Design a protein around this ligand. Structure first.
Ligand SMILES: CCCCCCCCCCCCCC(=O)SCCNC(=O)CCNC(=O)[C@@H](O)C(C)(C)COP(=O)(O)OP(=O)(O)OC[C@H]1O[C@@H](n2cnc3c(N)ncnc32)[C@H](O)[C@@H]1OP(=O)(O)O
Length: 422
Protein backbone atom coordinates (compact mmCIF):
# COMPACT_ATOMS: atom_id res chain seq x y z
CA UNK A 1 0.00 0.00 0.00
CA UNK A 2 1.63 3.24 -1.19
CA UNK A 3 -1.02 5.54 -2.68
CA UNK A 4 -3.87 4.55 -0.37
CA UNK A 5 -2.65 6.83 2.41
CA UNK A 6 -5.21 9.64 2.25
CA UNK A 7 -3.44 11.47 5.10
CA UNK A 8 0.23 10.54 4.95
CA UNK A 9 0.39 11.35 1.25
CA UNK A 10 -0.12 14.93 2.37
CA UNK A 11 2.75 14.95 4.88
CA UNK A 12 6.49 15.70 4.59
CA UNK A 13 7.69 12.12 4.88
CA UNK A 14 10.00 9.86 2.92
CA UNK A 15 8.35 7.75 0.20
CA UNK A 16 8.60 3.96 0.01
CA UNK A 17 11.66 2.70 -1.86
CA UNK A 18 12.82 6.30 -2.12
CA UNK A 19 16.52 6.53 -2.95
CA UNK A 20 17.75 9.22 -0.56
CA UNK A 21 20.92 11.01 -1.71
CA UNK A 22 20.74 14.15 0.38
CA UNK A 23 19.56 13.58 3.94
CA UNK A 24 17.75 16.46 5.64
CA UNK A 25 14.46 18.39 6.13
CA UNK A 26 11.78 17.73 3.53
CA UNK A 27 9.61 20.88 3.70
CA UNK A 28 11.12 24.23 2.81
CA UNK A 29 12.02 26.11 6.03
CA UNK A 30 9.36 27.98 8.01
CA UNK A 31 9.16 30.36 10.97
CA UNK A 32 6.91 30.01 14.02
CA UNK A 33 5.28 33.16 12.68
CA UNK A 34 3.83 31.23 9.73
CA UNK A 35 2.13 28.94 12.22
CA UNK A 36 -1.43 29.53 13.38
CA UNK A 37 -1.69 30.22 17.10
CA UNK A 38 -5.23 28.78 17.00
CA UNK A 39 -5.90 25.07 17.67
CA UNK A 40 -7.16 23.28 14.57
CA UNK A 41 -10.91 22.86 14.06
CA UNK A 42 -12.37 19.75 15.69
CA UNK A 43 -15.69 17.92 15.35
CA UNK A 44 -18.48 20.14 16.72
CA UNK A 45 -19.11 17.85 19.69
CA UNK A 46 -15.39 17.64 20.57
CA UNK A 47 -12.79 20.04 21.95
CA UNK A 48 -9.03 20.06 22.53
CA UNK A 49 -7.58 19.83 26.03
CA UNK A 50 -4.15 20.01 27.66
CA UNK A 51 -3.49 17.25 30.19
CA UNK A 52 -1.59 18.46 33.25
CA UNK A 53 0.50 15.48 34.35
CA UNK A 54 0.75 17.21 37.72
CA UNK A 55 -3.04 16.83 38.06
CA UNK A 56 -4.23 13.58 39.68
CA UNK A 57 -7.62 13.41 37.92
CA UNK A 58 -6.37 14.49 34.49
CA UNK A 59 -3.37 12.17 34.43
CA UNK A 60 -5.83 9.49 35.54
CA UNK A 61 -8.15 9.93 32.56
CA UNK A 62 -5.08 9.46 30.38
CA UNK A 63 -3.93 6.07 31.62
CA UNK A 64 -7.54 4.92 32.04
CA UNK A 65 -8.20 5.75 28.40
CA UNK A 66 -5.01 3.98 27.36
CA UNK A 67 -5.56 0.96 29.60
CA UNK A 68 -9.08 0.33 28.37
CA UNK A 69 -8.25 0.94 24.70
CA UNK A 70 -4.62 0.06 23.99
CA UNK A 71 -5.30 -3.58 23.08
CA UNK A 72 -7.20 -4.37 19.87
CA UNK A 73 -9.61 -7.16 20.96
CA UNK A 74 -11.84 -7.55 24.05
CA UNK A 75 -11.23 -11.33 24.01
CA UNK A 76 -7.50 -10.73 24.50
CA UNK A 77 -7.85 -11.39 28.21
CA UNK A 78 -5.17 -8.82 28.98
CA UNK A 79 -4.76 -5.05 29.06
CA UNK A 80 -1.97 -2.52 29.40
CA UNK A 81 -1.52 -1.15 32.89
CA UNK A 82 -0.02 2.32 32.64
CA UNK A 83 0.38 3.96 36.04
CA UNK A 84 0.76 7.45 37.43
CA UNK A 85 4.38 6.52 38.19
CA UNK A 86 5.02 5.39 34.62
CA UNK A 87 3.74 8.64 33.12
CA UNK A 88 5.37 10.87 35.73
CA UNK A 89 8.64 9.39 34.48
CA UNK A 90 7.89 9.34 30.74
CA UNK A 91 6.02 12.65 30.52
CA UNK A 92 7.99 14.90 32.86
CA UNK A 93 11.45 14.86 31.32
CA UNK A 94 13.03 18.36 31.34
CA UNK A 95 11.50 20.72 28.79
CA UNK A 96 8.06 19.11 28.91
CA UNK A 97 4.91 21.22 28.57
CA UNK A 98 1.29 20.47 29.42
CA UNK A 99 0.52 21.96 26.01
CA UNK A 100 2.13 18.98 24.31
CA UNK A 101 0.18 16.33 26.21
CA UNK A 102 -2.97 16.67 24.12
CA UNK A 103 -6.34 15.00 24.46
CA UNK A 104 -9.82 15.24 22.99
CA UNK A 105 -12.73 15.37 25.40
CA UNK A 106 -16.41 15.10 24.55
CA UNK A 107 -17.74 18.62 25.15
CA UNK A 108 -20.88 17.43 26.94
CA UNK A 109 -19.44 14.62 29.07
CA UNK A 110 -15.83 15.85 29.25
CA UNK A 111 -14.79 12.25 28.61
CA UNK A 112 -11.24 11.74 27.34
CA UNK A 113 -11.53 9.97 24.01
CA UNK A 114 -8.19 10.64 22.29
CA UNK A 115 -4.63 11.39 23.38
CA UNK A 116 -1.16 11.99 21.97
CA UNK A 117 1.99 13.50 23.44
CA UNK A 118 5.26 15.02 22.34
CA UNK A 119 8.48 15.54 24.27
CA UNK A 120 11.37 17.68 23.03
CA UNK A 121 14.66 15.95 22.34
CA UNK A 122 17.74 16.44 20.21
CA UNK A 123 18.10 13.64 17.67
CA UNK A 124 21.44 12.68 16.23
CA UNK A 125 20.99 11.40 12.68
CA UNK A 126 24.28 10.23 11.18
CA UNK A 127 26.08 12.93 13.16
CA UNK A 128 23.51 15.58 12.27
CA UNK A 129 22.09 17.40 15.29
CA UNK A 130 18.32 17.74 14.80
CA UNK A 131 16.14 19.55 17.35
CA UNK A 132 13.04 17.37 17.38
CA UNK A 133 10.28 15.78 19.38
CA UNK A 134 9.32 12.19 20.12
CA UNK A 135 5.65 11.37 19.67
CA UNK A 136 4.21 8.58 21.76
CA UNK A 137 1.13 7.22 23.49
CA UNK A 138 -1.22 8.03 20.61
CA UNK A 139 -4.60 6.55 21.45
CA UNK A 140 -8.12 6.95 20.15
CA UNK A 141 -11.08 5.42 21.96
CA UNK A 142 -12.41 2.18 20.45
CA UNK A 143 -15.79 3.88 19.89
CA UNK A 144 -14.10 6.51 17.72
CA UNK A 145 -12.10 4.18 15.49
CA UNK A 146 -11.93 4.38 11.70
CA UNK A 147 -13.30 7.92 11.83
CA UNK A 148 -9.98 9.49 10.81
CA UNK A 149 -9.49 11.39 14.05
CA UNK A 150 -5.83 10.40 14.17
CA UNK A 151 -4.74 12.66 11.33
CA UNK A 152 -6.23 15.61 13.20
CA UNK A 153 -4.35 14.66 16.37
CA UNK A 154 -1.17 14.44 14.34
CA UNK A 155 -1.76 17.76 12.60
CA UNK A 156 -2.65 19.55 15.85
CA UNK A 157 0.47 18.27 17.60
CA UNK A 158 2.56 19.20 14.53
CA UNK A 159 1.18 22.75 14.87
CA UNK A 160 1.92 23.20 18.57
CA UNK A 161 5.47 21.95 18.10
CA UNK A 162 5.98 24.09 14.99
CA UNK A 163 4.82 27.20 16.84
CA UNK A 164 7.77 26.45 19.14
CA UNK A 165 10.11 26.41 16.15
CA UNK A 166 10.67 22.61 16.20
CA UNK A 167 10.22 20.96 12.79
CA UNK A 168 11.10 17.27 13.06
CA UNK A 169 10.12 14.15 14.94
CA UNK A 170 10.82 10.49 15.55
CA UNK A 171 7.94 8.06 15.92
CA UNK A 172 7.60 4.30 15.78
CA UNK A 173 4.72 2.05 14.76
CA UNK A 174 4.09 -1.63 14.16
CA UNK A 175 2.12 -0.82 11.04
CA UNK A 176 3.87 0.05 7.79
CA UNK A 177 3.67 3.73 6.86
CA UNK A 178 5.53 5.80 4.22
CA UNK A 179 9.20 4.86 4.19
CA UNK A 180 10.39 3.64 7.58
CA UNK A 181 14.05 4.52 8.15
CA UNK A 182 14.41 1.16 9.89
CA UNK A 183 12.59 -1.91 11.19
CA UNK A 184 13.35 -4.06 14.24
CA UNK A 185 11.87 -7.27 15.57
CA UNK A 186 10.62 -7.83 19.11
CA UNK A 187 11.99 -10.73 21.16
CA UNK A 188 10.86 -12.08 24.55
CA UNK A 189 12.95 -13.71 27.26
CA UNK A 190 10.74 -15.87 29.53
CA UNK A 191 11.63 -15.16 33.16
CA UNK A 192 8.61 -16.85 34.70
CA UNK A 193 7.77 -19.55 32.14
CA UNK A 194 5.13 -21.43 34.11
CA UNK A 195 3.08 -18.24 34.60
CA UNK A 196 3.53 -17.02 31.02
CA UNK A 197 2.17 -20.35 29.83
CA UNK A 198 -0.80 -20.36 32.20
CA UNK A 199 -1.81 -16.82 31.13
CA UNK A 200 -1.31 -17.97 27.55
CA UNK A 201 1.64 -15.72 26.65
CA UNK A 202 3.94 -18.56 25.51
CA UNK A 203 3.31 -22.03 24.11
CA UNK A 204 4.45 -25.57 24.84
CA UNK A 205 6.13 -26.98 21.69
CA UNK A 206 5.18 -30.53 20.70
CA UNK A 207 7.54 -33.02 22.29
CA UNK A 208 8.25 -30.84 25.31
CA UNK A 209 6.97 -31.18 28.86
CA UNK A 210 6.24 -28.16 31.03
CA UNK A 211 9.26 -29.34 33.00
CA UNK A 212 11.61 -29.07 30.00
CA UNK A 213 10.63 -25.45 29.53
CA UNK A 214 10.86 -24.43 33.18
CA UNK A 215 14.35 -25.91 33.56
CA UNK A 216 15.37 -24.51 30.17
CA UNK A 217 14.37 -21.01 31.24
CA UNK A 218 15.39 -21.32 34.90
CA UNK A 219 17.70 -18.50 36.01
CA UNK A 220 20.27 -18.03 38.79
CA UNK A 221 19.11 -16.05 41.84
CA UNK A 222 22.11 -13.70 42.06
CA UNK A 223 24.00 -11.59 39.51
CA UNK A 224 27.53 -12.53 38.41
CA UNK A 225 29.29 -9.38 37.21
CA UNK A 226 31.73 -8.07 39.81
CA UNK A 227 31.30 -4.39 40.69
CA UNK A 228 27.70 -4.37 39.47
CA UNK A 229 25.42 -2.13 41.56
CA UNK A 230 22.56 0.38 41.23
CA UNK A 231 23.14 3.70 39.47
CA UNK A 232 23.52 6.72 41.78
CA UNK A 233 23.65 10.47 41.19
CA UNK A 234 27.33 10.38 42.16
CA UNK A 235 27.87 8.21 39.05
CA UNK A 236 26.17 10.53 36.54
CA UNK A 237 29.22 12.34 35.14
CA UNK A 238 31.09 9.09 34.37
CA UNK A 239 28.11 7.05 33.20
CA UNK A 240 26.95 9.88 30.97
CA UNK A 241 30.26 10.13 29.15
CA UNK A 242 30.55 6.34 28.90
CA UNK A 243 27.03 6.24 27.45
CA UNK A 244 27.57 9.04 24.93
CA UNK A 245 30.83 7.45 23.87
CA UNK A 246 29.30 4.01 23.29
CA UNK A 247 26.17 5.50 21.60
CA UNK A 248 28.20 7.46 19.08
CA UNK A 249 28.53 4.24 17.08
CA UNK A 250 24.84 4.26 16.15
CA UNK A 251 23.36 6.39 13.36
CA UNK A 252 20.04 7.25 15.05
CA UNK A 253 20.21 8.37 18.68
CA UNK A 254 18.76 10.82 21.18
CA UNK A 255 21.45 13.25 22.29
CA UNK A 256 20.76 13.58 25.99
CA UNK A 257 21.90 16.46 28.18
CA UNK A 258 23.20 15.40 31.59
CA UNK A 259 19.94 16.67 33.03
CA UNK A 260 17.73 14.62 30.70
CA UNK A 261 20.01 11.64 31.24
CA UNK A 262 19.73 11.84 35.01
CA UNK A 263 15.97 12.30 34.97
CA UNK A 264 15.63 9.34 32.63
CA UNK A 265 17.80 6.87 34.50
CA UNK A 266 17.35 7.64 38.19
CA UNK A 267 13.68 7.26 39.00
CA UNK A 268 11.51 8.85 41.65
CA UNK A 269 12.86 8.10 45.12
CA UNK A 270 10.60 6.32 47.61
CA UNK A 271 8.76 4.03 45.19
CA UNK A 272 7.85 0.48 46.32
CA UNK A 273 9.32 -2.42 44.36
CA UNK A 274 5.98 -3.13 42.68
CA UNK A 275 5.69 0.49 41.47
CA UNK A 276 9.28 1.30 40.44
CA UNK A 277 9.54 2.24 36.76
CA UNK A 278 13.19 2.69 35.73
CA UNK A 279 15.91 0.24 36.85
CA UNK A 280 19.48 1.39 36.09
CA UNK A 281 22.72 -0.41 36.98
CA UNK A 282 26.41 0.28 36.72
CA UNK A 283 29.63 -1.71 37.09
CA UNK A 284 32.39 0.00 39.09
CA UNK A 285 36.01 -1.22 39.16
CA UNK A 286 38.23 -1.07 42.28
CA UNK A 287 39.76 2.18 40.97
CA UNK A 288 36.36 3.89 40.93
CA UNK A 289 36.03 3.58 37.17
CA UNK A 290 32.59 2.89 35.72
CA UNK A 291 32.95 0.52 32.79
CA UNK A 292 29.37 -0.75 32.28
CA UNK A 293 25.81 0.50 32.36
CA UNK A 294 22.44 -1.00 31.56
CA UNK A 295 18.81 -0.31 32.28
CA UNK A 296 15.32 -1.66 31.80
CA UNK A 297 11.87 -0.31 32.59
CA UNK A 298 8.66 -1.86 33.86
CA UNK A 299 5.24 -1.65 32.13
CA UNK A 300 2.85 -4.33 33.45
CA UNK A 301 -0.27 -5.79 31.85
CA UNK A 302 -3.49 -6.50 33.73
CA UNK A 303 -4.64 -10.11 33.29
CA UNK A 304 -8.33 -10.87 32.76
CA UNK A 305 -10.54 -13.90 33.41
CA UNK A 306 -7.89 -15.83 35.33
CA UNK A 307 -8.49 -17.24 38.81
CA UNK A 308 -4.78 -17.52 39.59
CA UNK A 309 -3.25 -14.33 38.18
CA UNK A 310 -4.51 -10.80 37.52
CA UNK A 311 -1.23 -9.07 36.61
CA UNK A 312 1.79 -9.83 34.43
CA UNK A 313 5.21 -8.28 35.00
CA UNK A 314 6.88 -7.02 31.86
CA UNK A 315 10.40 -5.65 31.82
CA UNK A 316 11.74 -3.83 28.75
CA UNK A 317 15.49 -3.82 28.06
CA UNK A 318 16.35 -0.16 27.61
CA UNK A 319 19.62 1.80 27.27
CA UNK A 320 23.08 0.45 28.04
CA UNK A 321 26.79 1.01 27.42
CA UNK A 322 30.16 -0.63 28.04
CA UNK A 323 33.83 0.06 27.24
CA UNK A 324 34.46 -3.60 26.32
CA UNK A 325 35.47 -2.66 22.77
CA UNK A 326 36.85 0.87 23.26
CA UNK A 327 40.26 -0.67 22.67
CA UNK A 328 39.61 -1.41 19.00
CA UNK A 329 39.18 1.33 16.42
CA UNK A 330 36.69 -0.47 14.18
CA UNK A 331 33.42 -1.59 15.78
CA UNK A 332 33.10 -4.42 13.23
CA UNK A 333 36.63 -5.67 13.74
CA UNK A 334 36.00 -9.35 14.61
CA UNK A 335 38.06 -8.87 17.77
CA UNK A 336 36.06 -5.88 18.94
CA UNK A 337 32.90 -7.88 18.25
CA UNK A 338 34.06 -10.89 20.30
CA UNK A 339 35.08 -8.75 23.27
CA UNK A 340 31.75 -6.82 23.15
CA UNK A 341 29.64 -9.96 22.77
CA UNK A 342 31.18 -11.63 25.82
CA UNK A 343 30.56 -8.54 27.96
CA UNK A 344 26.99 -7.92 26.77
CA UNK A 345 26.07 -11.56 27.27
CA UNK A 346 27.37 -11.15 30.84
CA UNK A 347 25.68 -7.83 31.61
CA UNK A 348 22.35 -8.70 30.01
CA UNK A 349 22.30 -12.12 31.70
CA UNK A 350 22.48 -10.25 35.02
CA UNK A 351 19.82 -7.87 33.68
CA UNK A 352 17.48 -10.85 33.28
CA UNK A 353 18.36 -11.93 36.80
CA UNK A 354 17.63 -8.46 38.14
CA UNK A 355 14.37 -8.17 36.16
CA UNK A 356 13.19 -11.57 37.33
CA UNK A 357 14.11 -10.77 40.93
CA UNK A 358 12.14 -7.55 40.47
CA UNK A 359 9.17 -9.77 39.63
CA UNK A 360 9.20 -9.23 35.85
CA UNK A 361 7.63 -12.30 34.20
CA UNK A 362 9.06 -11.86 30.70
CA UNK A 363 11.86 -9.62 29.40
CA UNK A 364 11.36 -7.66 26.16
CA UNK A 365 14.04 -6.50 23.77
CA UNK A 366 14.27 -5.34 20.19
CA UNK A 367 17.00 -6.20 17.69
CA UNK A 368 18.19 -2.58 17.83
CA UNK A 369 21.58 -1.39 19.14
CA UNK A 370 24.11 -4.24 19.58
CA UNK A 371 21.36 -6.54 20.88
CA UNK A 372 21.77 -9.34 18.28
CA UNK A 373 25.14 -10.20 19.85
CA UNK A 374 23.28 -11.54 22.90
CA UNK A 375 19.62 -12.05 21.96
CA UNK A 376 19.78 -15.72 20.88
CA UNK A 377 22.40 -16.85 23.39
CA UNK A 378 20.36 -15.41 26.25
CA UNK A 379 17.19 -17.06 24.98
CA UNK A 380 15.22 -14.01 23.86
CA UNK A 381 12.78 -15.84 21.62
CA UNK A 382 11.59 -14.44 18.25
CA UNK A 383 8.45 -12.36 18.78
CA UNK A 384 5.62 -11.94 16.28
CA UNK A 385 5.74 -8.16 16.08
CA UNK A 386 8.06 -5.76 14.27
CA UNK A 387 8.66 -2.09 14.94
CA UNK A 388 9.13 0.47 12.20
CA UNK A 389 11.08 3.67 12.86
CA UNK A 390 10.10 6.93 11.18
CA UNK A 391 11.28 10.53 10.89
CA UNK A 392 8.82 13.40 10.37
CA UNK A 393 9.93 16.08 7.91
CA UNK A 394 13.31 14.39 7.51
CA UNK A 395 14.73 12.37 4.66
CA UNK A 396 17.39 9.85 5.68
CA UNK A 397 19.02 6.78 4.13
CA UNK A 398 18.00 3.35 5.49
CA UNK A 399 19.52 2.35 8.85
CA UNK A 400 20.18 -1.31 9.74
CA UNK A 401 17.58 -2.80 12.07
CA UNK A 402 19.46 -5.94 13.08
CA UNK A 403 17.42 -8.27 10.89
CA UNK A 404 18.28 -10.58 8.01
CA UNK A 405 15.89 -10.66 5.03
CA UNK A 406 14.23 -13.75 6.50
CA UNK A 407 13.59 -11.88 9.75
CA UNK A 408 16.25 -13.73 11.75
CA UNK A 409 18.75 -11.72 13.84
CA UNK A 410 21.65 -10.26 11.86
CA UNK A 411 24.46 -11.00 14.28
CA UNK A 412 27.25 -9.62 12.10
CA UNK A 413 26.02 -6.10 11.29
CA UNK A 414 23.69 -5.80 14.28
CA UNK A 415 21.92 -2.43 14.23
CA UNK A 416 22.59 1.24 13.79
CA UNK A 417 19.38 2.19 15.56
CA UNK A 418 20.57 3.52 18.91
CA UNK A 419 17.39 5.09 20.19
CA UNK A 420 14.90 3.08 22.25
CA UNK A 421 11.35 4.39 22.12
CA UNK A 422 8.67 3.59 24.67
C1 LIG B 1 7.66 18.30 13.75
C2 LIG B 1 6.53 17.91 14.70
C3 LIG B 1 5.65 16.79 14.15
C4 LIG B 1 5.09 15.87 15.24
C5 LIG B 1 4.15 14.78 14.70
C6 LIG B 1 4.84 13.49 14.23
C7 LIG B 1 3.91 12.62 13.35
C8 LIG B 1 3.78 11.16 13.76
C9 LIG B 1 2.86 10.92 14.96
C10 LIG B 1 2.19 9.53 14.93
C11 LIG B 1 2.09 8.83 16.31
C12 LIG B 1 2.74 7.43 16.34
C13 LIG B 1 3.51 7.07 17.65
C14 LIG B 1 2.62 6.17 18.50
O1 LIG B 1 2.03 6.65 19.47
S1 LIG B 1 2.49 4.44 18.01
C15 LIG B 1 1.32 3.79 19.27
C16 LIG B 1 -0.17 3.97 18.94
N1 LIG B 1 -1.09 3.24 19.82
C17 LIG B 1 -1.45 1.92 19.63
O2 LIG B 1 -1.03 1.26 18.69
C18 LIG B 1 -2.42 1.27 20.65
C19 LIG B 1 -3.91 1.65 20.45
N2 LIG B 1 -4.25 1.91 19.06
C20 LIG B 1 -5.12 2.90 18.68
O3 LIG B 1 -5.68 3.64 19.49
C21 LIG B 1 -5.36 3.05 17.16
O4 LIG B 1 -6.77 2.85 16.92
C22 LIG B 1 -4.81 4.40 16.55
C23 LIG B 1 -5.08 5.72 17.34
C24 LIG B 1 -3.27 4.26 16.49
C25 LIG B 1 -5.38 4.58 15.11
O5 LIG B 1 -6.77 4.97 15.11
P1 LIG B 1 -7.70 4.52 13.87
O6 LIG B 1 -7.51 2.97 13.51
O7 LIG B 1 -9.25 4.77 14.25
O8 LIG B 1 -7.21 5.27 12.55
P2 LIG B 1 -7.93 6.67 12.22
O9 LIG B 1 -9.35 6.36 11.54
O10 LIG B 1 -8.09 7.64 13.47
O11 LIG B 1 -6.96 7.40 11.13
C26 LIG B 1 -6.13 6.53 10.37
C27 LIG B 1 -4.93 7.27 9.76
O12 LIG B 1 -3.87 7.52 10.71
C28 LIG B 1 -2.78 6.61 10.44
N3 LIG B 1 -2.28 5.90 11.64
C29 LIG B 1 -2.86 4.89 12.39
N4 LIG B 1 -2.16 4.44 13.43
C30 LIG B 1 -1.02 5.15 13.41
C31 LIG B 1 0.13 5.17 14.21
N5 LIG B 1 0.43 4.41 15.30
N6 LIG B 1 1.11 6.09 13.83
C32 LIG B 1 0.95 6.91 12.77
N7 LIG B 1 -0.18 6.92 11.95
C33 LIG B 1 -1.08 6.04 12.33
C34 LIG B 1 -3.22 5.66 9.27
O13 LIG B 1 -2.16 5.15 8.47
C35 LIG B 1 -4.31 6.50 8.58
O14 LIG B 1 -3.79 7.45 7.65
P3 LIG B 1 -3.69 6.98 6.12
O15 LIG B 1 -2.75 5.69 5.96
O16 LIG B 1 -5.15 6.69 5.52
O17 LIG B 1 -2.98 8.19 5.34
Amino acid sequence: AMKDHKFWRTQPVKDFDEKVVEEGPIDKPKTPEDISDKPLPLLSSFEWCSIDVDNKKQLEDVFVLLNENYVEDRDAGFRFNYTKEFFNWALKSPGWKKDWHIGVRVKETQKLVAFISAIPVTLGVRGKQVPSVEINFLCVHKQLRSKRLTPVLIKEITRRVNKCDIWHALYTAGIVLPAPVSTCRYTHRPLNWKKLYEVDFTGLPDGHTEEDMIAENALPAKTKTAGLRKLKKEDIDQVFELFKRYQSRFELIQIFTKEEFEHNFIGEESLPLDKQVIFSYVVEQPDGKITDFFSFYSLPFTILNNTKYKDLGIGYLYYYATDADFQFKDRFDPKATKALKTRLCELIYDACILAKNANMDVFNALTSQDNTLFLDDLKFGPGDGFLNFYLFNYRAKPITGGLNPDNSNDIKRRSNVGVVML
